[PDB]
Design a protein around this ligand. Structure first.
Ligand code: RLU
Length: 167
């Protein structure tokens, strides 16, 4: 039993809710919140910009030190950093950004990072400003993630479309 409330169940292990991931994290304080990161951990906009704003830029400060030490992530890769005031940990996951020409096949690799964590709050990878089809992102998620994932879809209209078209 966990504290996630109001989600629709899609599969044995995948759940979905129309919610602002920022407000959801502040309420549940999950062990892991997933960030829709880029390889430079520059959290300027989208989910990353919103999460970082909610940490009062502490996420960005920590991320800049991470990059200075380790260099950029790989597309499809991830790193675990602090969750600041939002979660115990933030799993920064880099899905391919279609608006940069990155191979959409890397989306499965990106979701595989979720399997290293028993329970996660997460956005749809490569959705929104990353330019991929969110229906496809949900499909890859369901077919790749085996751990318990609670998906927050900010857009109500997109949420309804995702549910109504889910196979
Ligand atoms: O509309 C959607 O769900 C898709 C969209 N989501 C969010 O920007 C989002 N999601 C949840 N809480 C949030 N608070 C503030 C934004 C936000 C998205 C964009 C870029 C990438 Br890459 C991946 C997904």
């Amino acid at each position: 039993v966990n504290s996630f409330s109001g989600y629709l169940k899609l599969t044995d292990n995948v759940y979905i809710k129309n919610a602002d991931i920022v407000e959801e994290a502040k309420k549940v304080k999950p062990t892991v919140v997933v960030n829709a990161a880029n390889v430079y951990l520059k959290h300027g906009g989208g989910v990353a910009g919103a999460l970082n704003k909610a940490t009062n830029n502490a996420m960005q400060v920590e991320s800049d030190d991470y990059i200075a030490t380790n260099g950029p992530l790989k597309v499809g890769g991830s790193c675990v950093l602090s969750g600041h005031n939002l979660a115990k940990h933030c799993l920064h996951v880099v899905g391919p950004n279609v608006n940069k020409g990155e191979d959409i096949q890397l989306l499965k690799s990106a979701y595989e990072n979720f399997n290293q964590h028993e329970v996660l709050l997460a956005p749809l990878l490569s959705a929104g400003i990353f330019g991929a089809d969110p229906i496809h992102s949900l499909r890859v998620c369901v077919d790749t993630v085996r751990t318990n994932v609670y998906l927050a879809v900010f857009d109500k209209n997109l949420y309804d479309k995702l549910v109504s078209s889910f196979l």
